């Protein structure tokens, strides 16, 4: 960072933002995964048991990340607008 006696960019420029305390317990799940849950039920903790998200996550989504295969019942997870069509376009079930 030394740029000569001149004020470096990281002092030149201002701070912004705060950390909210949520990134570390919220994970995202892709379609290339979910079939590996070795039990055919997608819950809040099944995915934890399978070592796919992480032990301290409390919220999860699904997003549209391609390839959707075996029918799954996504329970206690949010599903994006797109993802619901892919999950159902291969059966599966969504419930709150």
């Amino acid at each position: 960072g030394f740029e000569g006696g001149q004020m470096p960019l990281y002092r030149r420029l201002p701070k912004f933002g705060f950390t909210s305390r949520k990134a570390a317990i919220t994970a995202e799940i892709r379609l290339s995964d979910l079939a590996k849950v070795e039990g055919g039920v997608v819950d809040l903790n099944t995915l934890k048991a399978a070592n796919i998200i992480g032990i301290q996550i409390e919220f999860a989504k699904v997003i549209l990340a391609g390839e959707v295969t075996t029918p799954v019942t996504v329970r206690g997870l949010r599903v994006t607008k797109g993802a619901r069509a892919a999950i159902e376009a291969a059966g599966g079930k969504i419930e709150e």
């Binding site: 960072g1 990281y10 201002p14």
Partner: protein
């Protein structure tokens, strides 16, 4: 020895999808009354670290 971050660097830059860094404009803090509204409008939105300046901030953020 794990590396130590220049911690002030980490409070002004966040890394984007391809590998550059986004940042906030200077001058937005005080002494705003004399500045034209247009000038402040184009300074509100975030910017990219320029090519000439990338060669050091990256030195400062090995864990970004």
């Amino acid at each position: 020895p794990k590396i130590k971050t220049v911690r002030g660097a980490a409070k002004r830059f966040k890394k984007t999808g391809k590998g550059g860094f986004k940042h906030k404009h200077a001058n937005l803090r005080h002494i705003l009354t004399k500045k034209a509204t247009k000038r402040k409008r184009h300074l509100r939105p975030k910017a990219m670290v320029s090519k000439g300046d990338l060669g050091l901030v990256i030195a400062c953020l090995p864990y970004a």
